[PDB]
Motif scaffolding. Sequence first.
Motif, PDB file in Angstrom:
ATOM      1  N   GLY A 181     -31.695  27.973   3.657  1.00 38.58           N
ATOM      2  CA  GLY A 181     -30.700  28.003   4.717  1.00 38.58           C
ATOM      3  C   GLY A 181     -30.717  29.205   5.649  1.00 38.58           C
ATOM      4  N   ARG A 182     -31.655  30.130   5.465  1.00 32.62           N
ATOM      5  CA  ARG A 182     -31.736  31.300   6.318  1.00 32.62           C
ATOM      6  C   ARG A 182     -33.184  31.616   6.732  1.00 32.62           C
ATOM      7  NH1 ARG A 182     -30.976  36.401   2.314  1.00 32.62           N
ATOM      8  NH2 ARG A 182     -33.213  36.674   1.747  1.00 32.62           N
ATOM      9  N   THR A 183     -34.005  30.585   6.886  1.00 25.95           N
ATOM     10  CA  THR A 183     -35.395  30.767   7.355  1.00 25.95           C
ATOM     11  C   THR A 183     -35.613  29.827   8.559  1.00 25.95           C
ATOM     12  OG1 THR A 183     -36.122  31.120   5.016  1.00 25.95           O
ATOM     13  CG2 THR A 183     -37.935  31.052   6.712  1.00 25.95           C
ATOM     14  N   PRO A 184     -35.126  30.241   9.760  1.00 30.75           N
ATOM     15  CA  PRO A 184     -35.241  29.328  10.930  1.00 30.75           C
ATOM     16  C   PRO A 184     -36.605  28.697  11.155  1.00 30.75           C
ATOM     17  CG  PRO A 184     -33.706  31.112  11.454  1.00 30.75           C
ATOM     18  CD  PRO A 184     -34.366  31.464  10.088  1.00 30.75           C
ATOM     19  N   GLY A 185     -36.602  27.371  11.324  1.00 35.05           N
ATOM     20  CA  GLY A 185     -37.807  26.651  11.715  1.00 35.05           C
ATOM     21  C   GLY A 185     -38.702  26.343  10.525  1.00 35.05           C
ATOM     22  N   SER A 186     -38.265  26.778   9.340  1.00 38.02           N
ATOM     23  CA  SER A 186     -38.999  26.547   8.098  1.00 38.02           C
ATOM     24  C   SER A 186     -38.953  25.078   7.616  1.00 38.02           C
ATOM     25  CB  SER A 186     -38.468  27.475   6.999  1.00 38.02           C
ATOM     26  OG  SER A 186     -37.231  26.947   6.534  1.00 38.02           O
ATOM     27  N   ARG A 187     -39.894  24.747   6.730  1.00 38.72           N
ATOM     28  CA  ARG A 187     -39.909  23.450   6.045  1.00 38.72           C
ATOM     29  C   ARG A 187     -39.408  23.579   4.592  1.00 38.72           C
ATOM     30  NH1 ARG A 187     -43.363  20.060   9.122  1.00 38.72           N
ATOM     31  NH2 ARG A 187     -42.740  18.370   7.704  1.00 38.72           N
ATOM     32  N   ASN A 188     -39.208  22.438   3.935  1.00 39.60           N
ATOM     33  CA  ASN A 188     -38.750  22.408   2.525  1.00 39.60           C
ATOM     34  C   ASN A 188     -39.578  21.319   1.868  1.00 39.60           C
ATOM     35  OD1 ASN A 188     -37.465  22.180   0.016  1.00 39.60           O
ATOM     36  ND2 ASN A 188     -35.486  21.419   0.848  1.00 39.60           N
ATOM     37  N   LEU A 189     -40.876  21.568   1.779  1.00 36.97           N
ATOM     38  CA  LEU A 189     -41.822  20.505   1.361  1.00 36.97           C
ATOM     39  C   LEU A 189     -41.684  20.139  -0.104  1.00 36.97           C
ATOM     40  CD1 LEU A 189     -45.136  21.369   3.259  1.00 36.97           C
ATOM     41  CD2 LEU A 189     -43.127  20.016   4.063  1.00 36.97           C
ATOM     42  N   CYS A 190     -41.143  21.046  -0.927  1.00 37.79           N
ATOM     43  CA  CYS A 190     -40.886  20.695  -2.344  1.00 37.79           C
ATOM     44  C   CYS A 190     -39.558  19.969  -2.572  1.00 37.79           C
ATOM     45  CB  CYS A 190     -40.988  21.917  -3.281  1.00 37.79           C
ATOM     46  SG  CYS A 190     -42.679  22.522  -3.388  1.00 37.79           S
ATOM     47  N   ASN A 191     -38.787  19.849  -1.482  1.00 36.06           N
ATOM     48  CA  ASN A 191     -37.484  19.186  -1.456  1.00 36.06           C
ATOM     49  C   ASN A 191     -36.478  19.749  -2.489  1.00 36.06           C
ATOM     50  OD1 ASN A 191     -38.394  17.189   0.683  1.00 36.06           O
ATOM     51  ND2 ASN A 191     -39.738  16.501  -0.983  1.00 36.06           N
ATOM     52  N   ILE A 192     -36.311  21.072  -2.478  1.00 37.10           N
ATOM     53  CA  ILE A 192     -35.451  21.757  -3.432  1.00 37.10           C
ATOM     54  C   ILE A 192     -34.786  22.972  -2.791  1.00 37.10           C
ATOM     55  CG2 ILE A 192     -36.446  21.299  -5.733  1.00 37.10           C
ATOM     56  CD1 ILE A 192     -38.035  24.089  -5.044  1.00 37.10           C
ATOM     57  N   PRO A 193     -33.571  23.315  -3.257  1.00 32.22           N
ATOM     58  CA  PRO A 193     -33.039  24.651  -2.876  1.00 32.22           C
ATOM     59  C   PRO A 193     -33.890  25.744  -3.496  1.00 32.22           C
ATOM     60  CG  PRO A 193     -31.557  23.541  -4.476  1.00 32.22           C
ATOM     61  CD  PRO A 193     -32.752  22.616  -4.272  1.00 32.22           C
ATOM     62  N   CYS A 194     -34.162  26.791  -2.737  1.00 34.04           N
ATOM     63  CA  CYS A 194     -34.933  27.936  -3.293  1.00 34.04           C
ATOM     64  C   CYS A 194     -34.292  28.486  -4.588  1.00 34.04           C
ATOM     65  CB  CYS A 194     -35.095  29.033  -2.256  1.00 34.04           C
ATOM     66  SG  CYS A 194     -35.917  28.469  -0.795  1.00 34.04           S
TER      67      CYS A 194
ATOM     68  N   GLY B 271     -38.749  37.102   7.711  1.00 36.86           N
ATOM     69  CA  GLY B 271     -37.399  36.640   7.376  1.00 36.86           C
ATOM     70  C   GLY B 271     -37.376  35.511   6.343  1.00 36.86           C
ATOM     71  N   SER B 272     -38.552  35.006   5.953  1.00 32.52           N
ATOM     72  CA  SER B 272     -38.647  34.113   4.829  1.00 32.52           C
ATOM     73  C   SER B 272     -38.413  34.951   3.551  1.00 32.52           C
ATOM     74  CB  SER B 272     -40.004  33.377   4.775  1.00 32.52           C
ATOM     75  OG  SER B 272     -41.075  34.328   4.674  1.00 32.52           O
TER      76      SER B 272
ATOM     77  N   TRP C 255     -41.687  25.727   1.520  1.00 36.13           N
ATOM     78  CA  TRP C 255     -41.677  24.960   0.255  1.00 36.13           C
ATOM     79  C   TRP C 255     -40.300  24.672  -0.251  1.00 36.13           C
ATOM     80  CZ3 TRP C 255     -46.005  22.800   0.014  1.00 36.13           C
ATOM     81  CH2 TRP C 255     -47.183  23.486   0.498  1.00 36.13           C
ATOM     82  N   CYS C 256     -39.331  25.479   0.160  1.00 33.05           N
ATOM     83  CA  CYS C 256     -37.979  25.302  -0.381  1.00 33.05           C
ATOM     84  C   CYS C 256     -36.934  25.633   0.675  1.00 33.05           C
ATOM     85  CB  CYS C 256     -37.767  26.129  -1.676  1.00 33.05           C
ATOM     86  SG  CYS C 256     -37.820  27.968  -1.390  1.00 33.05           S
ATOM     87  N   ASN C 257     -35.715  25.169   0.472  1.00 29.17           N
ATOM     88  CA  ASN C 257     -34.656  25.509   1.430  1.00 29.17           C
ATOM     89  C   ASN C 257     -33.700  26.601   0.933  1.00 29.17           C
ATOM     90  OD1 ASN C 257     -32.966  25.137   3.918  1.00 29.17           O
ATOM     91  ND2 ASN C 257     -31.524  24.416   2.393  1.00 29.17           N
TER      92      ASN C 257
END
Length: 129
Positions: free
Chosen positions: A67-80, A49-50, A63-65
């Motif tokens: 909004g539809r990948t439950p429990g995921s991180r956003n380590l690059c601090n950016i919207p996908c 689902g990523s 790496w990115c957000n």
Amino acid sequence: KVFGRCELAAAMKRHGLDNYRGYSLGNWVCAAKFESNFNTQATNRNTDGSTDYGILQINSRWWCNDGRTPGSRNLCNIPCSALLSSDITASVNCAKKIVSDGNGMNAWVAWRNRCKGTDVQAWIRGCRL
Ligand SMILES: [Cl-]
Ligand SMILES: [Cl-]
Ligand SMILES: [Cl-]
Ligand SMILES: [Cl-]
Ligand SMILES: [Cl-]
Ligand SMILES: [Cl-]
Ligand SMILES: [Cl-]
Ligand SMILES: [Cl-]
Ligand code: NA
């Protein structure tokens, strides 16, 4: 944007990816070729689902957000979405964090399977760089 081979090589170099963490520019060009066929707008859903985004197919699991990948991180601090831009800056900055994470370019499974060990210099052959 669909990049040409030498065009992408020159943009990658401009953004300091050439020999970043020891990986020559032809490694980066080869990974982009097989991840996105050089198309900045490439997206691909994963079975978990990523989603993978952009010229280097960066995964919303870590790496990115999006909004539809439950429990995921956003380590690059950016919207996908920032990874789909015609300007490759966000993709490059994130790839630098990815390739520093411990497994080098093995993070890109197509690089491991299709680029690693090959004549990667072919990818930048004939380019005014
Ligand atoms: Cl090509
Ligand atoms: Cl090279
Ligand atoms: Cl999310
Ligand atoms: Cl959706
Ligand atoms: Cl995070
Ligand atoms: Cl966001
Ligand atoms: Cl660019
Ligand atoms: Cl390495
Ligand atoms: Na995420």
